[PDB]
Design a protein around this ligand. Structure first.
Ligand code: FOL
Ligand code: FOL
Lengths: 182, 182
């Protein structure tokens, strides 16, 4: 189980339901690579996200391509147009991937939001890594990413495929971080 | 939604978890054919059965070839070696079935028993057909097919792919029947 998130200096990840920061072409690009790139011969990655997050993807981008899309909602009666699956909980979503037939099609599981879901998963017993983009500048948000327990998670000063120096796009700096827990 | 079964004159469907009658080659062929034949190429039929039914099939025929095998168990920790899916209830399996990614891989749904599964499936609301083979002899049995609500089901005097004549194998006579509920 991987988690991916981009967070401003103040830990906000959302605002009015949109990104608290202007679009970062390269950043979005990195999220496309990480969640798409399957380590295995002919397997696909599964992406799990709550309702608000599905809805925050430009319609013409739905469902995220090259990946299986799963929507968590204790509420929707049927899966939003374009989504692959609906689960009511995270636990039920994780279970489903343990189904023989699914197991052999899915490679990496990525949790891409939102807040309550990051919350649930970060707590989740087990081996988990967090891919965090630190957007070094203050943005006004209404939704925040949780504190990262530094008892439990460790930063990997190096990571196959992840750049190490500070990126800048539209006078906005940010670096890619990878934390692990076992 | 389809149910298929073979039944004695005394409505027996099993003994010491075996078939009450000697094996009928050609009746087996028919079960095989109907459960196997999909109207759509690139789609498979899904077979649902209770645990006792799973284990009742010769380890060599498990899972039933050319079909997705779904096991129903309240108990079971994980899915038995060879199953494709495991569900807790019929309602849960049907729900699995409406998942979009699953929806486009499966054509027809066949319920293969045991008497519990049959029963639950029988009253399930909707369009339902029952494919019943009446073996024209009494056989000692411990398991029994529920009775068909004639207030609800209607025998169709005909059906494509289903031979109308009284069949015989090894001195035993049997006939194929088709019942529908709307
Ligand atoms: N690093 C990181 N960056 C993000 O932008 C991000 N966004 C979410 C949630 N929101 C979204 C919203 C839109 C799209 C999206 O349109 N994705 C497409 C376009 C990628 C591109 O244009 O480069 C995709 O194909 O991945 C993805 C995630 C979760 N984790 C993130 N994590
Ligand atoms: N009409 C009907 N006849 C049955 O024998 C039957 N059996 C079950 C449950 N038990 C079983 C036990 C073994 C196999 C089985 O071995 N099937 C194989 C072989 C068929 C053949 O060899 O011709 C298969 O490929 O279906 C199937 C169902 C449920 N509905 C039935 N329904």
């Amino acid at each position: 189980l991987n988690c991916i998130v981009a967070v401003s200096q103040n830990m906000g990840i959302g605002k009015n339901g949109d990104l608290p920061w202007p679009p970062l072409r390269n950043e979005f690009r990195y999220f496309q690579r990480m969640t798409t790139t399957s380590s295995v011969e002919g397997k696909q990655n599964l992406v799990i996200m709550g309702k608000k997050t599905w809805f925050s993807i430009p319609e013409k981008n739905r469902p995220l391509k090259g990946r299986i899309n799963l929507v968590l909602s204790r509420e929707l009666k049927e899966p939003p147009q374009g989504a692959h699956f609906l689960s009511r909980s995270l636990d039920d979503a994780l279970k489903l991937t343990e189904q023989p037939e699914l197991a052999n099609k899915v490679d990496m599981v990525w949790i891409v939001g939102g807040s309550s879901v990051y919350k649930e998963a970060m707590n989740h017993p087990g081996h988990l890594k967090l891919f965090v983009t630190r957007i070094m500048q203050d943005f006004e948000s209404d939704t925040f990413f949780p504190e990262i327990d530094l008892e439990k998670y460790k930063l990997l000063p190096e990571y196959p495929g992840v750049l190490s120096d500070v990126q800048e796009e539209k006078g906005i700096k940010y670096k890619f971080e990878v934390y692990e827990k076992n």
